[PDB]
Coordinates of C-alpha atoms in Angstrom, one line a residue:
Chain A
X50 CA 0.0 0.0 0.0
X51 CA 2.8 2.1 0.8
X52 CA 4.0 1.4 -2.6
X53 CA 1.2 2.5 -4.4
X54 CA 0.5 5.8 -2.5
X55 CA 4.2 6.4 -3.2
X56 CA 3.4 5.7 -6.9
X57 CA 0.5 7.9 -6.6
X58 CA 1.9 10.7 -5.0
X59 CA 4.7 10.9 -7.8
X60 CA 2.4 10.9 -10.0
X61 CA 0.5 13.5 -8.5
X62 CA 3.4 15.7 -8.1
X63 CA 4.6 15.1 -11.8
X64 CA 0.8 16.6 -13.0
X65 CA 1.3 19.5 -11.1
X66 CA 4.7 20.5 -12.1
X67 CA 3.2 19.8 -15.4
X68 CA 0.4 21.8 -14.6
X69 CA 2.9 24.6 -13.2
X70 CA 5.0 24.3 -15.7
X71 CA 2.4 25.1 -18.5
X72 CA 0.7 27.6 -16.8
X73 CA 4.0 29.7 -15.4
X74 CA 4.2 31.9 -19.1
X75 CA 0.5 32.6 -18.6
X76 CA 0.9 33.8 -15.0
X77 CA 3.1 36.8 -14.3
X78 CA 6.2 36.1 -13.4
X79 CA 6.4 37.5 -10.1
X80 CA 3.5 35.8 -8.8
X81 CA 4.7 32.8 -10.8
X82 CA 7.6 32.8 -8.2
X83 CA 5.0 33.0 -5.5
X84 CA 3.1 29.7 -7.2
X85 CA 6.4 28.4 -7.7
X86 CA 7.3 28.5 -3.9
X87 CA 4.0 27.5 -2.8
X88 CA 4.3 24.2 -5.4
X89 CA 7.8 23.7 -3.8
X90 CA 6.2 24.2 -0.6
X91 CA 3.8 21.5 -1.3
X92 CA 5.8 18.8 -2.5
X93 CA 8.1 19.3 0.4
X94 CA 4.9 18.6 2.6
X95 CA 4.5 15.2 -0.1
X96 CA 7.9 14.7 0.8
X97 CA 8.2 14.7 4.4
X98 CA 4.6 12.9 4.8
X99 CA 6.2 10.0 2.6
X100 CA 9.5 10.1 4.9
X101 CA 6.7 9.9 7.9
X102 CA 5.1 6.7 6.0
X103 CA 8.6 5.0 5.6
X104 CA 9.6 5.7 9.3
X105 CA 6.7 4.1 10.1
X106 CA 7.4 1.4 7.9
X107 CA 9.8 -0.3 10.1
X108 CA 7.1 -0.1 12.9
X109 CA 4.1 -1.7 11.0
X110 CA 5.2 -5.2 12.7
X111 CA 4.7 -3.8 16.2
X112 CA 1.4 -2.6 15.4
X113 CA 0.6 -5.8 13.8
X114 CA 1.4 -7.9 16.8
X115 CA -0.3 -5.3 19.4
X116 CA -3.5 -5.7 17.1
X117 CA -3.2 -9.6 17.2
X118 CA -2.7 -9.5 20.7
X119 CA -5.7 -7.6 20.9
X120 CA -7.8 -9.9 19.1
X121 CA -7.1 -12.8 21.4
X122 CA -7.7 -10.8 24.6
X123 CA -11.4 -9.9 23.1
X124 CA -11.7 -13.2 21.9
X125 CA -11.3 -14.6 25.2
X126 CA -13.4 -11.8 26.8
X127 CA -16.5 -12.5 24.1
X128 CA -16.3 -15.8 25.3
X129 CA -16.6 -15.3 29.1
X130 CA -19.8 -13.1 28.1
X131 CA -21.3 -15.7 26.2
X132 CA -20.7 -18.0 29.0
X133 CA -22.3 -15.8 31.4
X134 CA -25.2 -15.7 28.9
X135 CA -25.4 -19.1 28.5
X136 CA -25.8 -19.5 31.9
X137 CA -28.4 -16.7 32.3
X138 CA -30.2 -18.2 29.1
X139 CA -30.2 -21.4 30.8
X140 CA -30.9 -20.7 33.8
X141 CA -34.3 -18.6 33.0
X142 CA -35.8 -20.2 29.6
X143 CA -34.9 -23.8 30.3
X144 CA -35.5 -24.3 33.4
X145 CA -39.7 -22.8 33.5
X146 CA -41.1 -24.9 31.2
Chain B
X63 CA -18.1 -47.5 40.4
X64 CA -16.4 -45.5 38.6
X65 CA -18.0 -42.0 37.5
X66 CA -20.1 -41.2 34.2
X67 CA -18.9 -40.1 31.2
X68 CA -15.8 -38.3 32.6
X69 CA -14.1 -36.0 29.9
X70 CA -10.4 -35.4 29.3
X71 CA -9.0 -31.7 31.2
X72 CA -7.4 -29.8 28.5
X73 CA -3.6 -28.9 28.3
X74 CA -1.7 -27.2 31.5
X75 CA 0.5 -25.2 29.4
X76 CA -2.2 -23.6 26.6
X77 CA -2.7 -20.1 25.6
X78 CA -4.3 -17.9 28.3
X79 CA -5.4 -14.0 29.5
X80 CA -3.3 -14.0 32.4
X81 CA -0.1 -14.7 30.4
X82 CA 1.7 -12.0 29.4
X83 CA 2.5 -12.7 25.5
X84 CA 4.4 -8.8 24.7
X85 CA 7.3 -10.7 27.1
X86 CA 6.5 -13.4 25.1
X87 CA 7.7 -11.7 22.0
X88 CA 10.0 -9.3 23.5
X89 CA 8.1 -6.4 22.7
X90 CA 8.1 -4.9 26.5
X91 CA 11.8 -3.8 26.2
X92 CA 10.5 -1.3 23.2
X93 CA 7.6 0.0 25.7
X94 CA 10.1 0.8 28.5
X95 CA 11.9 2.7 26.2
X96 CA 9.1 4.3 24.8
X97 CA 7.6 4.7 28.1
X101 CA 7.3 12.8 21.3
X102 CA 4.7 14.6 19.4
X103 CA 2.4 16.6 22.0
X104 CA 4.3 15.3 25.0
X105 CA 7.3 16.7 23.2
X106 CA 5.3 19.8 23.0
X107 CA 4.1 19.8 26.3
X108 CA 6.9 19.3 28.2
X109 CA 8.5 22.5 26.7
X110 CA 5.9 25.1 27.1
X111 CA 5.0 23.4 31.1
X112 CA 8.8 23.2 32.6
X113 CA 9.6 27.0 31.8
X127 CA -4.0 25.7 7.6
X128 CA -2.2 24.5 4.8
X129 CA -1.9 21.3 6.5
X130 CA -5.1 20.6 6.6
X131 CA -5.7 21.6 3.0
X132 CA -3.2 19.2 1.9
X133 CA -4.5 16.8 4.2
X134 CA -6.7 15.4 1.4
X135 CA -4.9 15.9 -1.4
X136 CA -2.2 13.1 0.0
X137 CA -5.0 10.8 1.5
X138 CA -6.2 10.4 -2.4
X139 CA -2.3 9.6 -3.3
X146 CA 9.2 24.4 -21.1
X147 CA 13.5 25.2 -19.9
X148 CA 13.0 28.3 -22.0
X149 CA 10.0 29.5 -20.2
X150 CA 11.5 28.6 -16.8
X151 CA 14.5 30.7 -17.9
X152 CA 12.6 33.6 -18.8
X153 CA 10.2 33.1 -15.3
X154 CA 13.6 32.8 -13.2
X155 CA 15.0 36.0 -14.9
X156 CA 11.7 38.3 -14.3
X157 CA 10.5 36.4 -11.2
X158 CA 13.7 38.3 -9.4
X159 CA 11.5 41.8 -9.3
Chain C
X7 CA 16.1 1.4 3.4
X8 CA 17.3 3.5 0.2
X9 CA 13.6 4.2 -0.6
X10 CA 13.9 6.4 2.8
X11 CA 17.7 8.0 1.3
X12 CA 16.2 8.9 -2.2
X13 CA 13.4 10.3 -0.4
X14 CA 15.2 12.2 2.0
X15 CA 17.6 13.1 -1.3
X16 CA 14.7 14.4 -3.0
X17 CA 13.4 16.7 -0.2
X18 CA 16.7 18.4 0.5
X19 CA 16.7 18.8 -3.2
X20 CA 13.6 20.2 -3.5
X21 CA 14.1 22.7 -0.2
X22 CA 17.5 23.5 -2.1
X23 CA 15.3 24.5 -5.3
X24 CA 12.8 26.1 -3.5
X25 CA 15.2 28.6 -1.5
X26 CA 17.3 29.3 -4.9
X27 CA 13.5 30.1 -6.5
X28 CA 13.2 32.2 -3.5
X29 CA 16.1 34.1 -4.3
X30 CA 17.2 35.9 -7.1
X31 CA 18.8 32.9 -9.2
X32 CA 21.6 34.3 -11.3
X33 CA 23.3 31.0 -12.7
X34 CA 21.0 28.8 -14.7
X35 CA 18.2 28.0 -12.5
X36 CA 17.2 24.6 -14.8
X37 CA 19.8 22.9 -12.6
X38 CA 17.0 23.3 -9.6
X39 CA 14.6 22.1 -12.0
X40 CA 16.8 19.1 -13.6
X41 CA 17.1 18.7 -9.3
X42 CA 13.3 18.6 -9.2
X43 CA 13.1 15.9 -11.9
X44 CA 15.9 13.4 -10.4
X45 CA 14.1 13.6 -7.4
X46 CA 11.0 12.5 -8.9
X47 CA 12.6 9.6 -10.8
X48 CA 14.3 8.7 -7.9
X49 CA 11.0 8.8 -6.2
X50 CA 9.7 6.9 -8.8
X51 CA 12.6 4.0 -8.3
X52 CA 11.8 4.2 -4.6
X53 CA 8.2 3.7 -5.4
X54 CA 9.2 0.5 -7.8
X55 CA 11.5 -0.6 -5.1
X56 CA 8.5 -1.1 -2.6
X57 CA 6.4 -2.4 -5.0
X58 CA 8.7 -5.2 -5.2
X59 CA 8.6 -5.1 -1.5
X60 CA 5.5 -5.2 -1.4
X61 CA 4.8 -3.1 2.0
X62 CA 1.2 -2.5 3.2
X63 CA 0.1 0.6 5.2
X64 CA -3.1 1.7 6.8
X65 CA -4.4 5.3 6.3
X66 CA -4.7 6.1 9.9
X67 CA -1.2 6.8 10.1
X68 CA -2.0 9.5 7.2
X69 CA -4.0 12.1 9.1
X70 CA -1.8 11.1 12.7
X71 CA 1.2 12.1 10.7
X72 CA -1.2 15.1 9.6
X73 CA -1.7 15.9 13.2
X74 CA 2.3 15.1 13.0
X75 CA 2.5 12.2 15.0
X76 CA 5.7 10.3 15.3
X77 CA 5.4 6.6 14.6
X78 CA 7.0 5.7 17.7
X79 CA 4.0 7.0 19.8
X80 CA 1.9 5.2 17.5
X81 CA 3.4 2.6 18.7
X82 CA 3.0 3.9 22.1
X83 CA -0.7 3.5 22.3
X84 CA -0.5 -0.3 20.2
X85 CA 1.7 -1.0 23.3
X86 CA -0.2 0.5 25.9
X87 CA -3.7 -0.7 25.0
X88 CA -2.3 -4.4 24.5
X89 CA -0.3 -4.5 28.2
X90 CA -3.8 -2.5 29.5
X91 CA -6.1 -5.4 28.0
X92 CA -3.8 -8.3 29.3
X93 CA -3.8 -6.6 33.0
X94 CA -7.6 -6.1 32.4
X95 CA -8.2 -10.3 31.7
X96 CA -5.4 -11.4 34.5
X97 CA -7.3 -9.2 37.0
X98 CA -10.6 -11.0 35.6
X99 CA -8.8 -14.2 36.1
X100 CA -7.2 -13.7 39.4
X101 CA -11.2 -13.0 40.5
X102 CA -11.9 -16.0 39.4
X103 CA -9.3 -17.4 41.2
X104 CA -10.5 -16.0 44.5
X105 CA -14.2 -16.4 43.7
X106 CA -13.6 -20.3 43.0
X107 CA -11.5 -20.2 46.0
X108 CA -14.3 -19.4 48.0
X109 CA -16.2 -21.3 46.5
X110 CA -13.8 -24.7 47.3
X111 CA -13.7 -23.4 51.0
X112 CA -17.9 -22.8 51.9
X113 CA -18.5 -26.0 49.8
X114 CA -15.8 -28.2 52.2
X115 CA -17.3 -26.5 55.6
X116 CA -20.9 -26.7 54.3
X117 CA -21.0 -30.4 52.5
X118 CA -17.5 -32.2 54.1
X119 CA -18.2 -35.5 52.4
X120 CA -18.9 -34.8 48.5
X121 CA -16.2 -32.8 48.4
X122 CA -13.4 -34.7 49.8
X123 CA -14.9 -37.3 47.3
X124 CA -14.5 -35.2 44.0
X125 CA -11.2 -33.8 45.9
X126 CA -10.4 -37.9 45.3
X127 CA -11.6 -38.1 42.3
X128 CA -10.0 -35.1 40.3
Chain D
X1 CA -47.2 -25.6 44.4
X2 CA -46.2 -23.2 47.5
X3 CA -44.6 -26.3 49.5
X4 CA -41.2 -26.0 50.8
X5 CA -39.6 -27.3 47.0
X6 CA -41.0 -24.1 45.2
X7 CA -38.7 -21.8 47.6
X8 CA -35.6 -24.4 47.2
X9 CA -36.4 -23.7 43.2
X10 CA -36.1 -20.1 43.2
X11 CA -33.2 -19.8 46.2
X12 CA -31.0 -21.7 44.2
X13 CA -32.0 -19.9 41.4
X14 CA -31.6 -16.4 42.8
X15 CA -28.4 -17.4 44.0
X16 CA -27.0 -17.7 40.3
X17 CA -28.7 -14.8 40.0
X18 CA -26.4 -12.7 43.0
X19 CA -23.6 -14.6 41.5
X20 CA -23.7 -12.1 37.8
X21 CA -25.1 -9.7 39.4
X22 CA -22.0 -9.4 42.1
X23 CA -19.9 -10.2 38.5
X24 CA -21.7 -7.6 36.6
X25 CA -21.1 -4.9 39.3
X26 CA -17.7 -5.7 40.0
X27 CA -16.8 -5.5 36.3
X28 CA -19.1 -2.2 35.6
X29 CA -17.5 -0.3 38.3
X30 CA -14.3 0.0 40.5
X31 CA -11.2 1.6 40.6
X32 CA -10.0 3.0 37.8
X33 CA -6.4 3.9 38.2
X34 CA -4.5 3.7 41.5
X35 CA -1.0 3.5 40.9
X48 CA -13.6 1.8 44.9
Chain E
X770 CA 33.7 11.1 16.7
X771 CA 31.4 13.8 18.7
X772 CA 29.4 11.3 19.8
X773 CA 31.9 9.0 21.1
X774 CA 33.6 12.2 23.2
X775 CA 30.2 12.6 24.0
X776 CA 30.6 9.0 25.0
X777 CA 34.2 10.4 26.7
X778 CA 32.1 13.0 28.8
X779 CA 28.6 10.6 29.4
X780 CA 29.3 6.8 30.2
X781 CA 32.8 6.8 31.9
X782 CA 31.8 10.0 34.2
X783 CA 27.8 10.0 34.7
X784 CA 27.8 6.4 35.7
X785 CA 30.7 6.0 37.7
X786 CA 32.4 3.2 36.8
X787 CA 29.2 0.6 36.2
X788 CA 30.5 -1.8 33.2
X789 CA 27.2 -2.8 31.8
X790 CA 26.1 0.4 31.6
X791 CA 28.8 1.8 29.2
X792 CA 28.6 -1.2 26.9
X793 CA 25.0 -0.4 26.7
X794 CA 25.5 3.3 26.7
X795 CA 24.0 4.0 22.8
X796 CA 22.2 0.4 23.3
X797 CA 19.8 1.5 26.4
X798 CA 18.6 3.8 23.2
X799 CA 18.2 0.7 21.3
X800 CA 15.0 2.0 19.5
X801 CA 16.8 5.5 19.4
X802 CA 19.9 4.1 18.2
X803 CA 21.7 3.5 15.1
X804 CA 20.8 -0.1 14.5
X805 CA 23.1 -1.5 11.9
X806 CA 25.7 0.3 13.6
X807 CA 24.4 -0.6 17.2
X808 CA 26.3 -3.5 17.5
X809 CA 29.5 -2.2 15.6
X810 CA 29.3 0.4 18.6
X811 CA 28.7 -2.7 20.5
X812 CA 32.4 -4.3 19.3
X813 CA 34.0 -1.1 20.5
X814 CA 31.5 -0.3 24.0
X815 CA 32.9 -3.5 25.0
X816 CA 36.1 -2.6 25.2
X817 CA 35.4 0.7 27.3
X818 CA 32.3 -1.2 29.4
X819 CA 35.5 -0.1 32.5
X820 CA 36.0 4.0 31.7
X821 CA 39.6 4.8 30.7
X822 CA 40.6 8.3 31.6
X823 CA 41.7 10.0 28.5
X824 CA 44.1 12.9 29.4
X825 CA 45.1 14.8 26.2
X826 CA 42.6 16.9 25.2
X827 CA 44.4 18.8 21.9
X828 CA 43.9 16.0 19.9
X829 CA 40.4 17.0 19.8
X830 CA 41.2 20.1 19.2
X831 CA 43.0 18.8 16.2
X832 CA 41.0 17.2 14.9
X833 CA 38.1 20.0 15.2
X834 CA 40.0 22.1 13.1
X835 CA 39.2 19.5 10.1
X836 CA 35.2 19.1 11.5
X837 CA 32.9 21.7 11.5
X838 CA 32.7 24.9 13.7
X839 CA 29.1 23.7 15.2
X840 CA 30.5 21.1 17.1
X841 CA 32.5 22.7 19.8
X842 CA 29.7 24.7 20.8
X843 CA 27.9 20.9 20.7
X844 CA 30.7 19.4 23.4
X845 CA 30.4 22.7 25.8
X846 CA 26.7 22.1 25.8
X847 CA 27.0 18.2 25.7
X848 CA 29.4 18.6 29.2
X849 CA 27.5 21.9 30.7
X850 CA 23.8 19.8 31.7
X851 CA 26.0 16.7 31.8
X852 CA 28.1 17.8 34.8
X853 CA 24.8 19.3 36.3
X854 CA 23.5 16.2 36.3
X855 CA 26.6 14.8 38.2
X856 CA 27.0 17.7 40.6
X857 CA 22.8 17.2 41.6
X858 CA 23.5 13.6 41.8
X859 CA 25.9 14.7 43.9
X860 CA 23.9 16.9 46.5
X861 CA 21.3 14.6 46.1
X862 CA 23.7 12.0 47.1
X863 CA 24.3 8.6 44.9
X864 CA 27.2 10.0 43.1
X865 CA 29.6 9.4 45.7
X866 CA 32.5 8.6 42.8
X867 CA 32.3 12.1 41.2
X868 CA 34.6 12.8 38.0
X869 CA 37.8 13.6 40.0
X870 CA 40.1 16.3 39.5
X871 CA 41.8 15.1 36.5
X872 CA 38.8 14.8 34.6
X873 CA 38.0 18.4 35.8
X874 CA 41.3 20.4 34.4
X875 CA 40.4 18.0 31.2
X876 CA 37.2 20.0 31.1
X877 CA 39.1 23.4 31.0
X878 CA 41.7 22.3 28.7
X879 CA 38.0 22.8 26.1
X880 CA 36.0 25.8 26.3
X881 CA 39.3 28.3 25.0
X882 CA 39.2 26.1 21.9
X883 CA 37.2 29.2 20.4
X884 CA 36.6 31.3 23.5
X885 CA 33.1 30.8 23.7
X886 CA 32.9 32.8 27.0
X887 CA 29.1 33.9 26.7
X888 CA 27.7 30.6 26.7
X889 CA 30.8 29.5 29.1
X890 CA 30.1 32.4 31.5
X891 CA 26.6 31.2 32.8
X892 CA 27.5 27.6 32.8
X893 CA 30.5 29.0 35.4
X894 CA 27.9 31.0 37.1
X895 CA 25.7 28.2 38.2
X896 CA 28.5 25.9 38.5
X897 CA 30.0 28.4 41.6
Chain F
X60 CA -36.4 -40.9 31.2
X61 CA -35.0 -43.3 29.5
X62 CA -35.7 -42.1 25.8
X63 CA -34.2 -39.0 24.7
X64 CA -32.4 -38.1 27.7
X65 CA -28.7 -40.6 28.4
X66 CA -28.7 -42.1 31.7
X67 CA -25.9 -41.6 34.5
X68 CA -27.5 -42.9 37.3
X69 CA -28.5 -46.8 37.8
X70 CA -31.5 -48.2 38.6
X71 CA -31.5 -48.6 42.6
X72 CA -33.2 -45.0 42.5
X73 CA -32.2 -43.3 46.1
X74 CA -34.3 -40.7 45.1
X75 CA -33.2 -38.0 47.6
X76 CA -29.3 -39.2 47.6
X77 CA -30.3 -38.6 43.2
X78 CA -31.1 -34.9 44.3
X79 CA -28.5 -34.1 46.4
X80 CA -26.0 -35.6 44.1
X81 CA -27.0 -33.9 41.0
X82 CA -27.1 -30.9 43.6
X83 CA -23.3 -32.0 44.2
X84 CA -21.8 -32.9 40.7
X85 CA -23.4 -29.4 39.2
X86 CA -21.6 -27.1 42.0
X87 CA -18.2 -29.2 41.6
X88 CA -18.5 -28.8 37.6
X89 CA -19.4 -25.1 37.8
X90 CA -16.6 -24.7 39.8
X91 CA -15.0 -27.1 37.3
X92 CA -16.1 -24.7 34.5
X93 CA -14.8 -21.6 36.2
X94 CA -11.4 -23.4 36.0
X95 CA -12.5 -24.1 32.5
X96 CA -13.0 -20.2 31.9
X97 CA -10.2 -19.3 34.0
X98 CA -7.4 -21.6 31.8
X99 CA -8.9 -21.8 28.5
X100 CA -12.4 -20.2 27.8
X101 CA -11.8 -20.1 24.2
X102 CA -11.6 -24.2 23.8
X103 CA -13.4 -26.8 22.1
X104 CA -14.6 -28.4 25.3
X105 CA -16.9 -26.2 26.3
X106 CA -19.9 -27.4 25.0
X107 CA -19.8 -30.7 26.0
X108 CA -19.6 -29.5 29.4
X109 CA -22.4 -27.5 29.2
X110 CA -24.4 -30.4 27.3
X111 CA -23.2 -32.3 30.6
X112 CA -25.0 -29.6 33.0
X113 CA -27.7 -30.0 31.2
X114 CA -27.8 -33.6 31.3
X115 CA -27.5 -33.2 35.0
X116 CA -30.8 -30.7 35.1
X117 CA -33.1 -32.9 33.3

């Protein structure tokens, strides 16, 4: 997944310097400097949230285990409920007839 | 006798709540160093947008004329 | 790995373009843009590197990383809320422990013999 | 009905009652961080 | 290199003289720590887990002259809250093997390496 | 009883020993199934120790 937002975000970043790129001689120049910077500023941002993505990249594994972990404890606590519910069930249909 | 239709006990040694599975794994060394972001931003300020524009923007993911815009751009 | 260096590579370059843009540019300013495009090749190689990886993310890591979050607290909470959940079930199961307890001790004082019989039997 | 086995019926069965009930209010409530 | 005199200044002075601490000075980090290099810092921890006291101090100062300007204002700021934490550790009362008085002149052999008095003179000033 | 229902107890029918010790054998396998939650809740062997409760109720 990381991949393809990678791939994605390229591409996005290619349109708009495209985009940039054929609209800078129709924009004056000086604020096609200020566009310019605010493009740059923008794929900076691109840039640094993908170097967030890949430092968390390393970390997917701990999150992984944590939410397997978590499974198993709510497996376990689902079936202590349907115990109890069993036994109320049990104990108050059953039993009257 | 003997008692009716006794069943087998399970395992002594099968996977429980009580058991701590993150030492298990080795992932409790990681939380004691871990135990930024607004902590790192709190600390600071207690001892003593276009972000969110572009917040959506990333969730979904010629030479000549850059000559002449870096030349007149300098004004 | 060196889809984190290219990436890294290619936002210095493209801070380095953006401050010469800022300024007033007097050698040829198409290197910064020739600097712009090998960072988006290289971004491009990066992305084709995890592709064959093959490395899956979820998106709520996008808007904590939009709030700015570090991965490592991330991790904090995964942590935190897996150690809280197993204290949560061994305190449920050291009630039980009790609570059975109790239960082995009134059922001995109140009915002696049945239970020294199943305390035979196992 | 209303002999002494109809009160043995619903003792036993209101003390599996006391017995979730005591489970359900010591799991709703208690103390929540102490380190009632 | 800053780093390991930051390593000269941190696990053979703070801890004071604890073996497994110093091996495991960048390793206690091991989440903050270079990880393909944590165990190549490992190889050479090992060797210094016991501190060694290092008396010359111009060979830094030689070797500075080839680094970067930013760093000796790094090493007066990497000793200045480091021997604070050893002098409150000292009122406070487990640091009862400070870093003696050879270590101490090898402190004042470094701040003239650019005469950075103004960030030397309040360090002094809470020091005395 | 002796159709749809299996049969644990013989024939000799000590009527209120039967009680108490269906009263007996239902408290020690509660408590037997509290172990049962306690170590694994999340095992196969569960239902057959309910279906043996229940045997013990009918």
């Amino acid at each position: 997944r990381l991949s393809t937002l990678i791939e994605f975000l390229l591409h996005r970043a290619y349109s708009e310097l495209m985009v940039l790129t054929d609209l800078l001689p129709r924009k004056s120049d000086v604020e096609r400097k200020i566009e310019i910077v605010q493009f740059a500023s923008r794929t900076r941002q691109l840039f640094v949230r993908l170097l967030a993505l890949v430092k968390w990249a390393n970390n997917a594994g701990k999150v992984e285990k944590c939410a397997m972990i978590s499974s198993f404890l709510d497996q376990q606590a689902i079936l202590f409920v349907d115990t109890a519910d069993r036994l109320a069930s049990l104990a108050r249909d059953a039993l009257v007839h | 006798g003997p008692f009716y239709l006794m069943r087998e006990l399970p395992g002594s040694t099968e996977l429980t709540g009580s058991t701590n599975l993150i030492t298990h794994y080795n992932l409790e060394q990681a939380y004691n160093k871990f135990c930024v972001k607004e902590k790192l931003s709190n600390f600071l300020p207690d001892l003593p947008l276009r972000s969110l524009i572009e917040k959506p923007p990333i969730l979904s993911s010629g030479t000549m004329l850059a000559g002449f815009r870096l030349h007149t751009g300098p004004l | 790995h060196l889809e984190e260096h290219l990436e890294k590579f290619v936002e210095n370059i493209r801070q380095l373009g953006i401050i010469v843009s800022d300024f007033q540019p007097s050698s040829q300013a198409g290197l910064n843009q020739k600097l712009n495009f090998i960072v988006t090749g290289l971004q491009d190689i990066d992305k084709c590197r995890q592709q064959l990886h093959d490395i899956t993310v979820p998106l709520e890591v996008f808007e904590y990383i939009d709030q700015g979050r570090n991965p490592q607290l991330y991790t904090k909470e995964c942590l935190e809320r897996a150690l809280a959940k197993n204290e949560q079930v061994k305190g449920k199961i050291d009630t039980m422990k009790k609570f059975k307890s109790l239960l082995i001790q009134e059922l001995s004082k109140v009915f002696p013999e049945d239970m020294a019989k199943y305390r035979s039997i196992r | 009905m209303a002999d002494r086995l109809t009160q043995l019926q619903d003792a036993v069965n209101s003390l599996a009652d006391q017995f979730c009930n005591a489970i359900g209010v010591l799991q709703q409530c208690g103390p929540p961080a102490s380190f009632a | 290199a800053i780093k390991k005199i930051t390593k000269d200044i941190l696990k053979v002075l703070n801890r004071k003289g604890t073996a497994e601490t110093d091996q495991l000075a960048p390793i206690v980090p091991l989440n903050p720590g270079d990880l393909t290099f944590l165990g190549g810092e490992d190889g050479q921890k090992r060797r210094r887990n016991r501190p060694e006291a290092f008396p010359t101090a111009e060979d830094i100062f030689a070797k500075f002259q080839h680094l970067s300007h930013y760093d000796q204002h790094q090493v007066t700021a990497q000793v200045s809250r480091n021997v604070l934490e050893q002098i409150t550790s000292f009122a406070l009362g487990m640091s009862y093997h400070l870093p003696l008085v050879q270590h101490v002149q090898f402190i004042f052999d470094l701040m003239e390496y650019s005469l950075s008095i103004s960030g030397l003179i309040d360090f002094a000033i809470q020091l005395l | 009883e002796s159709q749809g229902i299996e049969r644990l107890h013989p024939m000799q029918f000590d009527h209120k020993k039967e009680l108490r010790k269906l009263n007996m054998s239902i408290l020690i396998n509660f408590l037997d199934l509290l172990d049962i939650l306690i170590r694994s809740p999340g095992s196969i062997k569960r239902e057959e120790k309910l279906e043996d409760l229940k045997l013990l109720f009918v």
